[PDB]
Structure formats: C-alpha cells, structure tokens
C-alpha cells in the first residue's frame, strides 16, 4: 500500500517537488494539507503517498536529503512548502562539490544514518509498505553519490521491498561540471544491482524537447521539471487511483521487468505542452509513441520494445483507447519482441491532469535504452584514459580500479540489451 | 440432503462468486437480509437449497461459502455490499499484500502463512454438514493467487477432505482484460498441480465472454460487471441440478460420471444460449436454442468441436421445455452437424429440464428469456486453448524471461519444464482419442 | 496495411499470390512467427489452425480449409463417397473403389468374380499381384478411355477450384490436360497409361508443348472430331462433380460464424471415357498451376480470396 | 433414437436419449513449503552478505 518518498540533491528536490505540487492538485491537497476536491476518486487511495494528520490533513511521505541546505531552504518556502513534515528534512552543510565520492563515502557517510532513521519511523507507520521512491540526478554528488549510498542501505533494511527511482541523466548540452560522465557511470552500476525500476530522464531529450518541440529559444531547468513532473504524474497514476494494471509498484516490476539487470524504462507523454484544442485518441497514440515525445533520447526504431505500459487519462472511449493500440501493435510489430506474447497493456483512469482533458503516458522498457548507456560510456572513456579529473575522486580515498569496475559492469549493461535486441 | 462448499481465490474468484450468490437468491427468493419467506422450516431442514445454504435460528439463509484474497479491497467491496448480511465474518479471509501476478508468491511465500487459516475457517462450515459432498472452486489461471494459493489449497483439501469430490470453474486469461504478461506462466503451472486433484473442471475464457457481451449484449466495452454476470448464468446452469429438485447431475460425484471417463480430460466444454440484450424480442424455440449450443460463437471457450470427438454430452434446460420437444430437435441436429463420439461411448445426451426459466439481476444487460439450454460436452476440440497457452509459454520460457520473478520466490526452475512437460503429455492424451 | 505470414516456401502458387500482395504497395510481409498477421498461407501439414482467430483487433485468413483432407486423401475420399447420402453407394460419376489395408477386402473380392483393377495411395488383371503389393486403395481401371487423335493416347483433365470464405465455389475458366505422348495399349508399361506430367517427361512434347492440352485446342478438337463442344460433352459434369463433392463437405468445413476464416484451391483430376462421361480420379488440396496460367489465376486468388476480405484503395465461373 | 431413465417431479424432469450404440501426503507437502522457504532465506543470506562486503569497503575508502 504505502510508499515511502525520497527526494536527494538539488536536482532531486527540485523535481520532487514540482512532484509533490502537482499531484497535491490532483488530489485536492492545498499547501496546507487540507482536502478541497470534488470527487471520492481523489481520497480512495491517497495513503499510497500521503498520511493522515491530526484534523484530517494529509502530509507526504516524503525524506527531503541534501548536503547542503540551499535547495532545500527554497523548497520549504516554496508554494507546497509548509505541507511537508519538518521532521523529514535532513541536511548537511558541506556539499557534495559534484563529487559522487563525497555523496558516496565521505561526506555522505556522515548524514546517511540520520536518513535512516526517518526513513526507518515512515516506514514503522506503515500498515504495508510495498517500496521506496527516489528522485536524484546521476550528474551531481548528493543526488548520485549518497542517493545510491541511501538505496544500498535501505536494500539491506527492507531487502523485500522494491526500491524505485526517477533518475535524470546527464548531457553535455545541459551540464554543470565535466565530471558528470563520472558520477553517472558510478551511479548507473549502482542502479543496476539495487533497484527494481528505474526511470530513465535524459537531460538531453528533456531539453531538445523544450527548444524543438515546445519552441523555448532558451530553456530552463524550471521548463525541464515542467516535462518531469508532467511524466512523473503520468506514470505513478495507476499507482495513485483505482485501477486494474500495475497498480502496485511490484505488479508493475513483474509485468515490465523480464530480466533482473534490464529494468531502465523510457517514459513518454502526450500532449507535449509548456492549448484549448484537445486531441483524439488516434493522436494521442501516435504522439505518446513518437520518439519526439520519450523522455530519454534514444530512437525506439533501433532497438525493440520488451514491455510497454500505457496510460491514458481522461474522459474518453475506452473501445477506441483499445482499438488504437492494437492499431499501433499491429502495424509496427516488427519493434516489439515476438517472444513475450501481449507484451503491451494499457489503463485508463477518469481524472486527467490539471490543464487537459485528456493525456497519455508511455512507459517503455526497450532495448534502445543502451543508446543512453553508450552515451554516457562514451563519454566516461574520453576522459578516463587520460584519467582527467580523477584526483577529484582519489582524493577522497577512492582507486582507479573502481573507475574500471564501473565502466566495464555499464559496457555489460549494452551487451546485454544488445543481446535481446537481436534474439 | 448433502452439502457443499464453495470457495472463491482471487479477484476473480470472489467478484464472480459475488455474482453467482447474488443470482442464487434471487432464485430461491432469499433476501438481501438471508431471510427465505418459502422456507417455512425455520431454522433448519435438507431441502435441494440447503446443499449450499445453512440456517440460523433466526431464519437467516447463510451460503456455505468461504472467500479468500491475499489483497483486501476486493473482498472489503462484500463486507460492504448488498448481501453484506449473509456472510459471516469467519468467511471472509483477507490478507496485506497479494501475489503481485507470480504463482510462486502464492503458492510458497504467502500460501505458507496463511493455508492453515483457510483451512480452519473452511473446517468450521464442513463441522455444519451432516454429509459434506465436496468443494466448488472459483479461481482464475492467470493471477497469482488464483493460481498459485488455489493449487496449494485443492493439494490440502485431497488430504484433510480425501473422499470428498472438488469441481473448478476456471477463468482462463484473454489479453483483452489481462494484467499481467506472465498468466501464461501461471496458467500452466496451477494446472500441473492442480490437475490430480481436480475431479471436473470448467474452464472459461475471458475471450469469448467479452465476444459475448460485444456481439450480442452489444456492450462496446464490456467490463468485469458485464462479464461475471453472464457467468454466473453459467454456473447457475451447471449448479442449479444440486440446488433444486431432480434427477440428473444431484451430487457432485455425477458430474464425473456423466462427463469425465477419462480423469485426466476432466474439462468439460460449456456453451450456452440465448444470449439476449435487456435493451432490445422474438423468442427463440427448443430447436434454435439447442441449435445454438454447436455454433462456437456461443462457447465458453471459443473451438471446433466440429474437428475433436466427444466423449459426453448433458444438456441443462432451464424453463418452457418438454421432452418431446428436446428430442425433435436433437434428432434435427444429428442431420445437419458433425457430432462424432469416441467409438467406445455412446452416441446420445443427458437431458435435465428445470421449469423455472433463468432469473435475471434486475438492472442488469440480459433480458428475461422463456427458456434457455446449457450444454456440457466433454469434446478434445477444447484442447486448442491448451495448445494456445502452450505456445505462449514456449516462446517465454525459452528465453527465461520473467523466470528470476520465480525463483526469487523459492521456486526451482524445474518446476517450469516439470508443469511444461505435464502439459505436453496432456496434449498428446486429447490426440490419442480426437483420432 | 494488411499483414501476411509465409509458411509454406515450397508452394509454387502462393509464393506467386505473395510476389502479388508486395507489389500492390499495401501488404507487408512478416516473419513465419509473428501472430500479428490478417492472412497466413499456412504449411501443407500440421496447420495449427487452433491458434487462429485469437489475436484482438485483426480479422485473420488462412489458405486452406481445416477439415478438407477428407476430401484430398484418396483413402479418405473413398469412404467420403460411400458413407454421404449426398454421394451414396451408388454414385455413377466415382469408380468403384474399396479401402484395403495390409478394412475393404471380401467385398472386393466379391464384385471382382473387363476386369482390371489400379492400386494406388497417397494396374493388373488379377487381383493376387495386386494384394501382393500391399493403407491403399484399389478401384476399377477404366478401360475404354476416349483417346485424342492423331496419337491414340490417354489424358486426364485438370480443373482448379477456389472456395472463398463465403463457400463460393469459383470454377477456374482454364483448365489443361495432361496428355500421354504414347499410344494407349490394352494389352507393366505406366507410360501409355499414366498421364502425370513427371513420369511424360522421363515421345514427350510431340503432339503439344509438355504434353499439356489447353481448352481452346480440346475445345476445337471435339468439335471438329465428334461434333460437339467442350461445355457440353464434359465440362457440365465436371461442374456438377465439383459442386456434389464440396457442398457435401460444407457444413464439415464452414467457417461461416467461425473466429477466423478459410479458403483453399483445389485441383480436381477428372478422366473422360470414350462415350464422353466424366470421371472423378483425385482431388489436390495443394495443388500447382500451369505455367502459362499462373499469372492469371494466382490474380484471381487475390482478387476472390483475399481482397474480398482485405480489400485495396472475371476468369471464374461461379458455381 | 430411444428415451431411457425418465424421471418427473413437479419441478422438471431428466432423461437420456441414446442415439447409436458404441496423492502426496501432509509431510510431503510441508517439505515443499519449506524448501522453498529456505532457498529464500538462502537468497537473502548470499544478498546480505554482499551487502556486508559494501560496507566493509566503504569503510576502507
Ligand atoms: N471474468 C473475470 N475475470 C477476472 C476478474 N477479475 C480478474 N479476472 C482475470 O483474472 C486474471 C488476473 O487474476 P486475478 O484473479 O485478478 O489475480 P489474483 O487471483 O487476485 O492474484 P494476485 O492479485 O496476483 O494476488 C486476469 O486474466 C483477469 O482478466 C473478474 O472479475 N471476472
Ligand atoms: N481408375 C483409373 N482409371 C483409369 N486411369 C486411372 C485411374 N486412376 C488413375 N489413373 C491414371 O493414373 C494416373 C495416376 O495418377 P493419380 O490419380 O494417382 O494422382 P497423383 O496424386 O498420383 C498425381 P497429382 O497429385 O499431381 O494429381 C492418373 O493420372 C490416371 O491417368
Ligand atoms: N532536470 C533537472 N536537472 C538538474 C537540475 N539541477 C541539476 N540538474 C542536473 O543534475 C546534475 C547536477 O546534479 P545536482 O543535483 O545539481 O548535484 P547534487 O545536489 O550533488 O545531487 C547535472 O547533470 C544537471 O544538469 C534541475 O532542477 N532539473
Ligand atoms: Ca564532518
Ligand atoms: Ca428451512
Ligand atoms: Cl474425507
Ligand atoms: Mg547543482
Ligand atoms: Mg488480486
Ligand atoms: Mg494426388
């Protein structure tokens, strides 16, 4: 039933929450914690995200976490700020300098278990926690270092728990330092042992979205989070409302994770906006798998789909919703692997987000995905061989060796999709 | 008078019995409350409906029945609904967290902690019968409870309840309304360990019931609601025989007679007709209706008997019909259809007539008809639906894909071509006597 | 765009439909096991016709008709004649034939006491060498068959049917014979007696080209040898063969309200005695074209078959 | 085409028309239950152990 919500890092906190703004609005949550909606559909299964207070008021199971308090100082006097528990801020003063060493072994170590401990009296409070929730980028310190720091330790606490991350990757067209190739490859093994779901958010797609697409001459990381929370809602509503598929973030594993190590999904969303026409349901179908339209840059046409979960909000006809994505299957069957069967399922809910009528959600488990991996190997290699930046990272207590390790367990990670991708 | 348990897994399960109990009081006029004004035996007798209802002191009716989820929410909607009177806390057992579409969850990890309990609560309402038949079972094949803790349940009840006869109806999955990729997996594993220790089992495919509801409901996009009460029409039609006066299929251990020579083909083909939408009608004779049980549009799972042979045939009316007018239409029939036996049985039917014509939810897609006919024809077409679910499970499995899901349940991996391999020798069974 | 599967690579006339479905610009071609197809032109054995019918969204056809080997078996065939009252015991158009094993024995015996027999399966005067050879069938030799002139020699007729999803029975307008370069002696030699196109071409090519006789030449032969025409003498109950055969075994077949739907070509082999009565030899469930013809028909395949089911942005005669 | 076994009672009536002639134990299950229950502990063993090793080498960084 409940999850548990972690948010590390700016960037982490920055997106979770937007995160927590818009489904506050979904559910009719105001800043305060007080319910203000119109339908039962909003309060029918809002303990997944939120418990309930005194007096009737909802509070996010949410564990902000940084190193420094910076970003979090904003959060808390932000919009949805004073809904958060002041308990669940947890922060440093140091900082991380962009350095997945200090998240990971030094000055993370020094803020983990205090992490734990409120991580340790949400999860106490629930009836039946069914995972854990993390929003990090993979660029930074905090976010990747002691945010994969964190997902290690709560694996070996609640090791039959699924632990699910939205993860933003780096790119050079949106980059802070040059070591983000770095802290990506690091977090990205971490990942791929110690988590059941990762959603994979390219920086990259996130921005050539805002400047093509939505025609922003210069974006923003505020345009960015626009995308990301419009996604992160997207794909937790089964989670949030009544429904049959994937309801539960385990269900959700079983039915897009075929193979442990492959579980690195390709979110899309439909309409892609910054309108008063709504779309058509062929539209939105076509849109939602236009790869315009996915949240991390890589071409479904160079690779095959082992799984994909669909989402449609709003109200519409359910029999064209059907019709459409058997259109879709049927016409381009060659991209999804003959041998998982009905590999594609679909919901629907009523309710669709604040601003349309009517908008879909792509989830994608593809073996294109190793374009994203590749990318990032790229460029950990270009600057590895001459070991560039690396006394950032010794200098923390770490060895060359780990570097290779890391890289060489990525380098796997394309061999086995490559693998399925020609099965 | 000897009675019988039903006991619904899953979902699917619990939301069809819910359905099927709904149409059993209206039938014998029990109210939402388990008052039984007819019943002037208060608090007790052995009349035809007590075989799968008790009596309490205060005339109360209560199902023998017990309804078991490993999620809550499905079976907090019978603690809460309209016949939320007739049950007895004791029979609603829930649990915290469900099988999560893995028959492996089911069978080990939670079926372990929970298959004592079920068994305890189901011992309370077999300690109420003077002569307990056995067990009806409601499960689907491709949820993890309904596949994984049903065939750890049916392997206990062989056990503590060993002369006692247990009959399934199954739902087999449709992509259509499926959840989960693996049902394939699932299916097939829950019928390998379950299939010693089912007596009879009727299987249905979501498929043609949602055919059903769009073709001749005219339901664009039916629902769970839509589908399980056209089911319970079905099992009403194979129930009502225990739960009424007569003379034909009174006892679970009949329904192996007539159907079942053979115990490992214990899955008999069910087709049912008319079909009428309550939103249109001329009304259909003995000849058409029973025409209708050989169109494959009207099976419970969609096949060619035409290109199987048949090894049993029981035809079920339920209201205006008389004798002279079944065999009129069967000798009409033998003329113009492929029907083909088995060489060593005989060539004939089982006729069981009920007046009363089916009853009809108020408010609900099917219109009240003046007679209608449920065929149970034990034919080897209905193999094509393993075959189809073989082949699914072949592409999967050759990959293992989804099999670490298993595993990391305390699963061995033989256990996936243990099932396969019990599935291909079924196959092979049903080649054997189709030819 | 429709889909189609190929599983069938040695299949002459729908590797030609296939060639068709491409080049209108609104078929694609999908690999042998991807269920995702409208139209399967399925293998000639073990057709799993159980998985047809049961994919959502996509109305599927296959290339043949589950249940037709009745008809296509020659022991098969036999018992189909004599166990129909459609066709009966005593059908005048069917040799007399009898299912022998090595069962239909005594009463072959029986009508055996002209008298020679063939002996066949999927020709002697005495029925001893013909058990000793010996599941096969054994039906009368048809000893007065009409000889062409010049050459004195034997031939059968071959005519190519196509039943649609519908159960139209669409007659190919074009039919051939295959003839025998060597004259029919009454008195072990298979050449003069067989006229299958293999065992010609192994005297072949001198009275047509590879011994194949087409309608207009048989058609103008009748009537300038025995005054009459082809329609006429033969082709009225070749028509009616065809019909009593297919409509028998139509409600066996039909896949009227059926989840998915069949057609099939058949090749019916049919031989002519010298009083111009027709016969019925064979029936070909998967049967090859003339060269010459295999344009034309393999068109009309697409045309009645397919896009009648699937259609796009007459050479048959309908029975 | 014979009728045989014909019973009537005032809420219907059945019949037959003949056109043409012609397990393991409770221990045994127990053991099941529990070997699977072991693999499991086993699994989480070997995952806690490499947990173990993590931490040992997050110490010595
Ligand atoms: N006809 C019908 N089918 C149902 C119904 N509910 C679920 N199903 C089918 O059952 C299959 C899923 O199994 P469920 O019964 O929902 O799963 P479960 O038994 O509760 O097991 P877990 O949820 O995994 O613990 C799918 O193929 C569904 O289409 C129902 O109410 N009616
Ligand atoms: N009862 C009969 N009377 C006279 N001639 C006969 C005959 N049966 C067969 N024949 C001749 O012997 C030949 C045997 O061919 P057959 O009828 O067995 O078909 P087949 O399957 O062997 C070749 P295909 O499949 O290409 O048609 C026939 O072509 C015919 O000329
Ligand atoms: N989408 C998005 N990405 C961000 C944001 N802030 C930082 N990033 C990305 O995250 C990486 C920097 O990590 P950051 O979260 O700032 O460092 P941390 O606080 O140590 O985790 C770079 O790749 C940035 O592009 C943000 O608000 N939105
Ligand atoms: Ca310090
Ligand atoms: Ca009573
Ligand atoms: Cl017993
Ligand atoms: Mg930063
Ligand atoms: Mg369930
Ligand atoms: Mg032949």
């Keep these: ?423 | 008078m000897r009675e019988c348990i039903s006991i619904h897994v899953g979902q699917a399960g619990v939301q069809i019995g819910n359905a099927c109990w709904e149409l059993y009081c209206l039938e014998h006029g029990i109210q939402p409350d388990g008052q039984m004004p007819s019943d002037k035996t208060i608090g007790g007798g052995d009349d035809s409906f007590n075989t799968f209802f008790s009596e309490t002191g205060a005339g109360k009716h209560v199902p023998r029945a017990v309804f078991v989820d490993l999620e809550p929410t499905v079976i907090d909607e019978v603690r809460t609904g309209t016949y939320r009177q007739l049950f007895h806390p004791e029979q609603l057992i829930t649990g915290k967290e469900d099988a999560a579409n893995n028959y492996a969850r089911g069978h080990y990890t939670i079926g372990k902690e929970i298959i004592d309990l079920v068994l305890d609560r189901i011992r309370k309402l077999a300690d109420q019968c003077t002569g307990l038949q056995g067990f009806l079972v409601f499960h689907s094949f491709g949820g993890g409870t309904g596949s994984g803790f049903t065939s750890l349940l049916m392997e206990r009840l062989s056990v503590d309840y060993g002369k006692k006869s247990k009959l399934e109806f199954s739902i087999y999955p449709a992509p259509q309304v499926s959840t989960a990729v693996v049902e394939p997996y699932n299916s097939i594993l829950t019928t390998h360990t379950t299939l010693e220790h089912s007596d009879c089992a009727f299987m249905v495919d979501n498929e043609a019931i949602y055919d059903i509801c769009r073709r001749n409901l005219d339901i664009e996009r039916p629902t769970y609601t839509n589908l399980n009460r056209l089911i319970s029409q079905i099992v009403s039609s194979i129930t009502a025989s225990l739960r009424f006066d007569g003379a034909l299929n009174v006892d679970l251990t009949e329904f192996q007679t007539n159907l079942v020579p053979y115990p490992r083909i214990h899955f008999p083909l069910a087709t049912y007709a008319p079909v009428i939408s309550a939103e249109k009608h001329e009304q259909l004779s003995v000849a058409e209706i029973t025409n209708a049980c050989f169109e494959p549009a009207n099976q419970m799972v969609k096949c060619d008997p035409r290109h199987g042979k048949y090894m049993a045939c029981c035809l079920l009316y339920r209201g205006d019909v008389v004798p002279k007018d079944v065999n009129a239409a069967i000798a009409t029939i033998k003329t113009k259809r492929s029907i083909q036996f088995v060489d060593w049985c005989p060539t004939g039917f089982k006729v069981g007539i009920n007046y009363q014509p089916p009853t009809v939810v108020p408010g609900g897609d099917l219109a009240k008809v003046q007679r209608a006919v449920c065929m149970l024809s034990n034919t080897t077409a209905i193999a094509e639906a393993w075959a189809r679910l073989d082949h699914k499970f072949d592409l999967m499995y050759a990959k293992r894909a989804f099999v670490h899901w298993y595993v990391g349940e305390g699963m061995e991996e033989g256990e996936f071509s243990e099932a396969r391999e019990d599935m291909a020798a079924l196959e092979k069974d049903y080649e054997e006597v189709g030819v | 765009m429709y889909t189609f599967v190929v599983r069938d690579e040695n299949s002459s006339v729908y590797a030609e439909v296939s060639r068709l479905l491409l080049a209108t610009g609104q078929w694609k071609r999908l690999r042998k096991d991807n269920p995702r197809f409208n139209l399967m032109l399925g293998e000639r054995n073990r057709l799993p016709f159980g998985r047809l019918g049961h994919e959502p969204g996509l109305v599927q056809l296959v290339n043949y008709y589950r249940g037709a080997d009745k008809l296509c078996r020659k022991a098969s065939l036999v018992k189909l004649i004599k166990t129909s009252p459609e066709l009966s015991e005593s059908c005048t158009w069917f040799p007399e034939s009898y299912v022998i094993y090595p069962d239909e024995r005594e009463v072959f015996l029986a009508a055996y006491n002209g008298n020679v027999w063939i002996a066949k399966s999927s020709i002697s005067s005495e029925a001893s060498e013909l058990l000793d050879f010996i599941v096969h069938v054994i039906q009368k030799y048809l000893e007065k068959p009409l000889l062409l002139e010049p050459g004195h020699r034997k031939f059968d007729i071959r005519s190519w049917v196509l039943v649609d999803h519908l159960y139209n029975i669409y007659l190919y307008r074009e039919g051939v014979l295959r003839t025998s370069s060597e004259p029919y002696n009454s008195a072990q030699d298979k050449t003069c007696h067989l006229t299958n196109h293999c065992i010609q071409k192994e005297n072949y090519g001198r009275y047509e080209e590879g011994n194949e006789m087409f309608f207009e030449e048989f058609n103008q032969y009748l009537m300038d040898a025995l005054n009459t025409t082809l329609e006429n003498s033969i082709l009225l109950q070749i028509k009616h063969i065809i019909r009593s055969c297919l409509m028998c075994i139509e409600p066996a077949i039909s896949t009227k309200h059926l989840h998915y739907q069949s057609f099939q070509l058949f090749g019916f082999d049919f031989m002519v005695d010298e009083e111009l009565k027709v016969w019925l030899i064979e029936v070909n469930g998967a049967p090859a074209c003339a060269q010459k013809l295999y344009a034309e028909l393999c068109q009309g395949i697409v045309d009645v078959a397919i896009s009648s089911v699937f259609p796009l942005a007459s050479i048959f005669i309908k029975l | 085409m014979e009728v045989i076994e014909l019973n009537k009672c005032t809420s219907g009536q059945s019949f037959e028309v003949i056109l043409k002639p012609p397990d393991p134990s409770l221990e045994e299950i127990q053991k099941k239950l529990e070997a699977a229950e072991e693999r499991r502990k086993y699994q989480e063993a070997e995952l806690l152990k490499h947990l173990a090793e993590k931490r040992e080498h997050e110490r010595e960084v």
């Design chain 1, 1 to 423: 039933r409940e999850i548990v919500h972690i948010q590390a890092g700016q960037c982490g906190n920055q997106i979770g929450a937007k995160f927590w703004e818009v489904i506050s609005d979904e559910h009719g949550i105001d800043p305060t914690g007080s319910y203000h909606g119109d339908s039962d559909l909003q309060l029918e299964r809002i303990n997944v995200y939120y418990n309930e207070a005194t007096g009737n008021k909802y509070v996010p199971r949410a564990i902000l976490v940084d190193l420094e308090p910076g970003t979090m100082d904003s959060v808390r006097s932000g919009p949805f700020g004073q809904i958060f528990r002041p308990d669940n801020f947890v922060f440093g003063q140091s900082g991380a300098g962009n350095n997945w060493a200090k998240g990971h072994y030094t000055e993370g170590a020094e803020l983990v278990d205090s992490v734990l401990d409120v991580v340790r009296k949400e999860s106490e409070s629930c009836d039946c926690l069914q995972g854990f929730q993390l929003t990090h980028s993979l660029g930074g310190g905090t976010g990747s270092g002691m945010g994969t720091l964190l997902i290690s330790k709560i694996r070996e606490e609640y090791p039959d728990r699924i632990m699910n991350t939205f993860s933003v990757m780096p790119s050079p067209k949106v980059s802070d330092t040059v070591v983000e190739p770095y802290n990506a490859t690091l977090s990205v093994h971490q990942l791929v042992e110690n988590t059941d779901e990762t959603y994979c958010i390219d920086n990259e797609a996130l921005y050539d979205i805002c400047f093509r697409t939505l025609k922003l001459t210069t974006p923003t990381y505020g345009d960015l989070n626009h995308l990301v929370s419009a996604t992160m809602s997207g794909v937790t509503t089964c989670l949030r409302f009544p429904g049959q598929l994937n309801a539960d973030l385990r269900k959700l594993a079983v039915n897009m994770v075929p193979f442990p190590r492959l579980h690195f999904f390709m979110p899309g969303f439909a309409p892609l906006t910054s309108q008063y026409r709504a779309l058509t349901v062929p539209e939105l179908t076509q849109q939602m798998f236009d790869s315009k339209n996915m949240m991390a840059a890589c071409d479904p046409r160079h690779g095959r789909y082992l799984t994909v979960a669909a989402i449609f909000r709003g109200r519409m006809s359910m029999k064209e919703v059907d019709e459409q994505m058997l259109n879709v299957q049927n016409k381009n069957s060659s991209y999804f692997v003959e041998w998982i069967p009905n590999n594609v399922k679909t919901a629907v809910c009523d309710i669709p987000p604040r601003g349309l009528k009517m908008s879909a959600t792509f989830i994608g488990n593809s073996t294109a995905i190793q374009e994203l991996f590749k990318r990032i190997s790229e460029q950990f290699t270009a600057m590895f061989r001459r070991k560039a930046f690396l006394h950032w990272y010794t200098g923390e207590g770490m060895d060359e060796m780990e570097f290779t390790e890391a890289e060489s367990n990525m380098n796997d990670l394309v061999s086995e999709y490559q693998q399925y991708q020609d099965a």
